[PDB]
Design a protein around this ligand. Structure first.
Ligand SMILES: Nc1ncnc2c1ncn2[C@@H]1O[C@H](COP(=O)(O)OP(=O)(O)O)[C@@H](O)[C@H]1O
Ligand SMILES: CCOC(=O)C1=C(C)NC(=S)N[C@H]1c1cccc(O)c1
Ligand SMILES: [Mg+2]
Length: 332
């Protein structure tokens, strides 16, 4: 089964002043998420769900990485393909979890910033883990985004944010596709990571100015490919290639996101073991087909809010994530 975890965001200053009380309770020991759906103080009703891991509002970035990503990166380094999806309503922490932010007032360098998310921590760790273990390696990254079923390359420095990419089936891969023009940037060392990320961020700002609700309606796929070569004591070369897809999905809240709709239908088809799985019905599911009931080790981080105002969407997200737990994958 694929791994499904839940992360609740902490209250913001506005909610803090309103003396808001959380309707979400996370028990890491029991690995459960309990939501107050009604009831008055001394008695109420609740909805509880169990997941592989649960992270409360106070969970720090480093702990999400240690608990969820560390094991996944080790697998990527073993030469397997892995994917991590961030799913949930806009404003619940998908981007904070997948990307992170900078601590205010330049208190920390990017490498030591406690607010850094999965992407920067992962890139930094790859270089650390392969510092001198005898494995020669190269790291390449790409950032593909889907908006209104159109494809954009956020790491191409010479292309206009208006330029769309074309997708084709891979002749030498039945369930694979080729994204013509998608640029792969080589990360030569840890000291090249931040600037590369900043460039993509700058280009996304241009995208936001041009496309409506870009940050919430778009799907982003940040891919890291590690080509590795080991040489045995007898001179033989051992090759392994690991790939990690870090996906920040469009907000799940209740116009017409074909890829988001298709992702849900694919999950339903997989869990209900229906013969036909509609992978080809959206660009997102075609690109990530192997991550959904395929040979890629997949994990989903469902993000929720502690505010009573978001009760309906929170329950929807939990029900969606809990169902996804039934998806079966077959690693390499
Ligand atoms: N774990 C967290 N700790 C501190 N702040 C968080 C956390 N998660 C989310 N936030 C804050 O909550 C807001 C949620 O925004 P964001 O990450 O962009 O959500 P989304 O991508 O799901 O729309 C941001 O301002 C972010 O800084
Ligand atoms: C200009 C600020 O940029 C950022 O915060 C980030 C960018 C560009 N890209 C990603 S994936 N994550 C953010 C990030 C990167 C490194 C350390 C951090 O603490 C936060
Ligand atoms: Mg976001």
């Amino acid at each position: 089964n694929i791994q499904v975890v839940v992360r609740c965001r902490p209250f913001n200053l506005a909610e803090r002043k309103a003396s808001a009380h959380s309707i979400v309770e996370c028990d890491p020991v029991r690995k459960e998420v309990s939501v107050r759906t009604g009831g008055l103080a001394d008695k109420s009703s609740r909805k509880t769900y169990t997941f592989d891991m649960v992270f409360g509002a106070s969970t720090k970035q480093i702990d999400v990485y240690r608990s969820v990503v560390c094991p996944i990166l080790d697998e990527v380094i073993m030469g397997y393909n892995c994917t991590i999806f961030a799913y949930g309503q806009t404003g619940t922490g998908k981007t904070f979890t997948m990307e992170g932010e900078r601590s205010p007032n330049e208190e920390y360098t990017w490498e030591e910033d406690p607010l850094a998310g999965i992407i920067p921590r992962t890139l930094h760790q790859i270089f650390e883990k392969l510092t001198d273990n005898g494995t020669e390696f190269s790291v390449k990254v790409s950032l593909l985004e889907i908006y209104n079923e159109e494809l954009f390359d956020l790491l191409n420095p010479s292309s206009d944010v208006s330029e769309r990419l074309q997708m084709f089936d891979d002749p030498r891969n039945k369930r694979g596709v080729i994204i013509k023009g998608l640029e792969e940037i080589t990360v030569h060392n840890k000291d090249e990571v931040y600037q590369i990320l900043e460039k993509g961020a700058a280009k996304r700002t241009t995208a936001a100015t041009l496309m409506n609700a870009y940050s919430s309606r778009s799907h982003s796929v940040f891919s890291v490919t590690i080509h590795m070569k080991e040489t045995t004591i007898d001179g033989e070369e051992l090759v392994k290639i690991g790939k990690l897809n870090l996906v920040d999905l469009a907000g799940s809240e209740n116009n017409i996101n074909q890829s988001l709709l298709t992702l849900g239908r694919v999950i339903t088809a997989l869990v209900e073991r229906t013969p036909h799985v509609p992978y080809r019905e959206s660009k997102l599911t075609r690109i990530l087909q192997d991550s959904l009931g395929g040979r890629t080790r997949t994990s989903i981080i469902a993000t929720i809010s502690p505010a009573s105002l978001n009760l309906e969407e929170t329950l929807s997200t939990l029900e969606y994530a809990h169902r996804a737990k039934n998806i079966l994958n077959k690693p390499e």
